[PDB]
Symmetry: D5
Subunit: 156 residues, 10 copies
Amino acid sequence: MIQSQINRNIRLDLADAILLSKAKKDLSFAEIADGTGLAEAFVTAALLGQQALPADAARLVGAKLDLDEDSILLLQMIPLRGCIDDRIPTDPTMYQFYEMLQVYGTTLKALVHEKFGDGIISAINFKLDVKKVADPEGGERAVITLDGKYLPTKPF
Amino acid sequence: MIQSQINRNIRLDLADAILLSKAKKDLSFAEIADGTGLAEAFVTAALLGQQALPADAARLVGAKLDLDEDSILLLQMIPLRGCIDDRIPTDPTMYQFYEMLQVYGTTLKALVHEKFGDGIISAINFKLDVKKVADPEGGERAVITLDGKYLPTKPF
Amino acid sequence: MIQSQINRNIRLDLADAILLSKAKKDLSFAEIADGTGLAEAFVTAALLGQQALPADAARLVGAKLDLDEDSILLLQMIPLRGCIDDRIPTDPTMYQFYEMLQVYGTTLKALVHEKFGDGIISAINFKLDVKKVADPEGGERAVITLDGKYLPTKPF
Amino acid sequence: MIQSQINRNIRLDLADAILLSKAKKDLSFAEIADGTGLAEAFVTAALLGQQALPADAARLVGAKLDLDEDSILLLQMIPLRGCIDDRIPTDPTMYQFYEMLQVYGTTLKALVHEKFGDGIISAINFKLDVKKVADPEGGERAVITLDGKYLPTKPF
Amino acid sequence: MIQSQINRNIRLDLADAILLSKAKKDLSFAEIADGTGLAEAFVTAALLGQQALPADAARLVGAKLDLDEDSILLLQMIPLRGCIDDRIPTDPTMYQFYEMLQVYGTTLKALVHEKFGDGIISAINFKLDVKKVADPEGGERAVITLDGKYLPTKPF
Amino acid sequence: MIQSQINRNIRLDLADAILLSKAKKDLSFAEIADGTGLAEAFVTAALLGQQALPADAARLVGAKLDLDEDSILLLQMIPLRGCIDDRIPTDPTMYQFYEMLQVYGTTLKALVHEKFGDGIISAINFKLDVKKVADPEGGERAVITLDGKYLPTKPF
Amino acid sequence: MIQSQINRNIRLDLADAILLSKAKKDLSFAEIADGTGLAEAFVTAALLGQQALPADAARLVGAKLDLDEDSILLLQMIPLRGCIDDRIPTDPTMYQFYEMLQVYGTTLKALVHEKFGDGIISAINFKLDVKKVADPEGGERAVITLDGKYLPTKPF
Amino acid sequence: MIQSQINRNIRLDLADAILLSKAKKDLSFAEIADGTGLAEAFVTAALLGQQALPADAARLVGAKLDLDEDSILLLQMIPLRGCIDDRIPTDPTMYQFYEMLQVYGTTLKALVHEKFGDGIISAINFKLDVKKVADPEGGERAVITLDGKYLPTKPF
Amino acid sequence: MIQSQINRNIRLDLADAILLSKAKKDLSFAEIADGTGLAEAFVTAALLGQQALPADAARLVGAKLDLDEDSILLLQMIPLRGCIDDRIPTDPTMYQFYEMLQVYGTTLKALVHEKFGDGIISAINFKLDVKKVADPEGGERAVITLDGKYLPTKPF
Amino acid sequence: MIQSQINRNIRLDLADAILLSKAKKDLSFAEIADGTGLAEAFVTAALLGQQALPADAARLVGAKLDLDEDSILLLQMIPLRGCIDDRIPTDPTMYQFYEMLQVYGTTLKALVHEKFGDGIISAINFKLDVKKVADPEGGERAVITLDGKYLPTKPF
Ligand SMILES: [Cl-]
Ligand SMILES: [Cl-]
Ligand SMILES: [Cl-]
Ligand SMILES: [Cl-]
Ligand SMILES: [Cl-]
Ligand SMILES: [Cl-]
Ligand SMILES: [Cl-]
Ligand SMILES: [Cl-]
Ligand SMILES: [Cl-]
Ligand SMILES: [Cl-]
């Protein structure tokens, strides 16, 4: 039977315990996700309290991180989502994504309505991935792909 | 000589005027940008107060939209950027992008640090674009590509 | 060509002008929506700046309310939605609905996950209606039906 | 003698404990409420700290979940209600209901005054329920019924 | 047909104009409410944007204050209520009432539940009045009576 | 020698402990205050962290509730007052009193100035009480009397 | 008959006009308050929207500043007080007084309770003055005297 | 070597422990500061976490209050100052001082600039004291003296 | 006679007008400050509402910008300082300086106390400047120097 | 493998433990950073939870402070940065840096744009140092050098 959380702090406390174990074992998110059949972004989100793992995935990552039974069960709970402490991130790495919305948020709205129509690009019927690539000018770039379903707003 | 703004309301009020003109002329953002040599996302952002147009582009869009000279000059000013009225978007279309950050913000942080290192993906050395792709299961998806330079944080 | 707003105040100022005209003519929302082919809640939301009207509906309500051409045009624009002045309504009538969420929000989440699964009940693929019904015990009740699509959250 | 709470955290801490037991026992809210004579929404709300259980119902759910006496007592206290952590929900599932208010809030006000008069639709003399209905276009919808008494505002 | 507002600033701007007229005519709130058949507190609240006046009351106070027709019509509209600029009053006179709630709010909850039961004392089925009385120790006291219906919260 | 608090959490935590003891003993506020010589609203406010008990009353209520010596001493401290968790109450029972201020705050100011003069009605030289009165139309009403000294603001 | 305001912006807009006139005439606050028989701090506060002037003083300052009749009447109204734009001052001069409260607020509470007892030092039965005194170490000091009545909090 | 704090809670938690000890020993702030050679306002502020005590004063107060060594060392640390829990005080005693700034803040700014010039009255080069004086009309007054260095803002 | 502002919007509106004139005349801040004898940072801050210009400097920049007499007079007023719209900058250029504080704020506190002692580095007895320096690895750097007087916090 | 944090409190609690140990050993930040091969400002920021130490540096500071293995591992994790408790510092020492931004933030924007162009001065490609220098007029100054890369914002 599906189970869900209502207070984010239970899963966020579990996340901190996970990260400590992870650091002690010197593991990567890539290797934790290996063998689950699931995308690195999805598994990582789950570890960090923002997705639920199916039972087999939770047992696998639980074994890798030496997690107790309560914790393996908690990982399967549908979370009370919201990773930002207090609305606006303080961390520079997180903040930059917020700044992309402060600069381009209204452009995204405008071009979504022009290209698709009234409605939204879904954060639910949705996937994301992160790739590292050389910058032709030197250094490296991230190519982060947001891939969401268009859900129309129609009159009724 | 470069000119800059300090009160976003001057360019945001201009944005509303531009949008009224645009609607009266039944024009698209694609057609406004066509001929400037600049990407639609850039030109659109400038119209909406989040980027500066070079003089020629300002005159070109100014002609298309029947703008006055003060408006054409304002478009060339470096803006006081920030398109969200009060931190958290109210508009569903815009909010969904904020929700992507509430769900994946910490994952983005975690995977940036694993793939690149300490530091940030830049919103300055940065571009984005929006593409419509057919969803195999029916309907349409938006593929939004965030493309940002990695700037490392190193000891000194 | 579709047109969209980025500052809610343009359509909110239009809403106030609409309401003054409505009052001067002593019209009801029921009578304004009649003949549009659209639900009273949808048309009303449009007048109040929270939905877009198709052109024929915009011209029709514009005739009833004696709106100028710019106003008729504005009603067809995709709005920057968000009716609540500052996050939490101050008006008692509006506040009661927010209180429903303060008492039942987490119950809604839990029951949605149990009955449907991980994911959301959509406010986009969505309809609302308000019915007045006599209370068997004396007085009147409102039956407000929220009717939203289930969109699942699945691993990837 | 009736007993009441003044700090929501006592009952919200209990809720988390309840949710862990419920998960360990692989129980549903449906099952837990069955046998109490109380609506599933009402019982679930009580477990989640937003309603008080009558003594018999508290003892019944208490047995199912293996709760200690103090917990069974706490379930019977009139709660300090307010399930949302910090005014605006972060969780997508809960947020969609807030968005319904951001889109339709002023419409609900307007149509309530039109249909009933000045005053409110009550969140106190109030029932809600969640029903799953097949969507003719495929998949599933939730029909959530908010059923509140009209309380008039009259001159005095 | 009943008419309602959605932007408090319209009626609050009218309140400021009413107050200037009132001061120029050197009128009291008691004199303005006189003849109206309505309580001083109700009529005053209406002038200040927090109640609607019945048509005859509006015309009567409109005559006293020399209001134009748009204003007499506005006073009949159901308001978007909320007199506090930004949640917490700055004005010492208003603040003291908020302080009463900071000191006694939980006591009022506790004693309402003990004396009446679960539920609320209504701010809708509600009367307020202010009396001036001598303090037996010297000076003067306000006796402010909050008279609200008990609305029970009952299981379902 | 008088003793005072600077952090409300110490007395608020004691209040939760007091309420758990009260509930285990199935005691009422009326019976806890009875015998102290102090008004029920005052004693209740003390228990809930918003007033100081004199030593004898502290020992009396401490015997009734089986409190330890540090707790009995804490009850005698002048509190750091403020019962509302985060400025605006979330609990419907407490919120209704806030709403009375959102509706009637400016009216209270205006009528206080008219009847008394510039200055305040004091929340310090102040008492309150709650009386249950039959509603002639059916049910029960609370008459809550706020009784405060007028303190004038005069030129100097 | 006493008259009062409910929106601070009316008197704050007047204050700005007063300050421009004052600057054009190169007047001091000392000389504006001369002849009024009132303290410079009181009269100045009135000009800046935080006190009411008696009629004679209003006419006198109105003459000196070339104010129109509506402005002279406005100066006589009891204000909606609150001079800080958004709770915490931005201006360094004003912020230093707020910092004094951030450093010494709890000390003030503690020493007030010890020296006087439970209750408050009043901001209403109150005066303040600003004196310049030479610093023996070089330069100048301000000695700002806050003089307020002790109002006791007593059991009842 | 000088030592400093960055999280206020460590010293605030210590303050609470100090206050319990103080109350158990029935001590006054006056008695605790006696023999330190330092002003009671300064010593009190230190105990409450807003100043650092010199080693000899820390040891003297620590013996009076039976503090452990870690506590005596903590009192000598330079604090992370800020005594107000959340910007605006909730406590009536502390709030009245914030209200003096809401009423007179701008007047203080204006008179400081007139009497001294551009710049600030310092909260750093600063002392305060609280004196009790009889009120001729009956009762007691607090004369609180804020004594700060004028620091000019000069062009460069 | 020195004159001061209490509402920042007056000078911030003037700043907008100045910037439009500056842009029309294609002027730089460097050339506007030239001839004034005042640092570029100081003059610029004045134009932007954050400093007061001496009379001669006001007349000089006024001539360059073609300002009217009221504008020249406003530039000499001591401002109500505070350039950030709502506490945290939205603009990326301004935000980075805030971020410097989020990362290094506690380090600045710690090192200031170590190097100097208890107290502050002054924002009043303060200057700043911005220099451009070539980056040895390519591109350009800004070396921004914050130069503030140490003011000690001493016991009393 | 690189390891990162997502909850600032883990490292902030570590910071507090570090500062206790540091105080018990009577150590300076200068001495702690000595031998590390890294700048005092960088090492200090790491201790305070705002930077990551390389392994050797972490082991060395760990030896000087007698940290346990978990603590030495935590120091190597990339932090969830953000040292300010709640956006605006309450501590006077930290606040003054924020005030610098309230006075000069817009000037910094304007001058950055003029001297470099559109874009930012980076807080990432960035170093900071604090130098104590005698003031020629008497006393001491801090010279705080902010040294950041210019990152241009270019059209595309
Ligand atoms: Cl990925
Ligand atoms: Cl695009
Ligand atoms: Cl249900
Ligand atoms: Cl009355
Ligand atoms: Cl307390
Ligand atoms: Cl009572
Ligand atoms: Cl004075
Ligand atoms: Cl003192
Ligand atoms: Cl200003
Ligand atoms: Cl410079």
